[PDB]
Design a protein around this nucleic acid. Sequence first.
DNA 1: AGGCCCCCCCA
DNA 2: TGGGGGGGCCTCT
Lengths: 57, 45
Amino acid sequence: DRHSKVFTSKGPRDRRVRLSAHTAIQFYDVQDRLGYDRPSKAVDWLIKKAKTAIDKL
Amino acid sequence: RDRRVRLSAHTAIQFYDVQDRLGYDRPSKAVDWLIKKAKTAIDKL
DNA sequence: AGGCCCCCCCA
DNA sequence: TGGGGGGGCCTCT
């Protein structure tokens, strides 16, 4: 009934990711500063901010 | 206790790619990586 | 890690 | 109505 997976280069993967307790603290801190309703918008932002780090592989 | 984030299909795909390109086992460690590599932008918010 | 169920809110 | 989010819990590898 609910879209729960996504197909990736290394198989099926879930759209609901678990976070370590420490990492949740940091990420939720980021979501608070960005003010985004839904978390995906925060993750998008991080990815865009880390563009050059990602681009250097 | 079991903290999780629900991603959109579009965002999941972009994120898992970053995780694969980083070669990390756990997604949580990829989220640590993005946060550290964006502190300068985060701190400026 | 995947899966289920629930409940709340929005569109 | 449909679809989103998180909490809470279970069961497997």
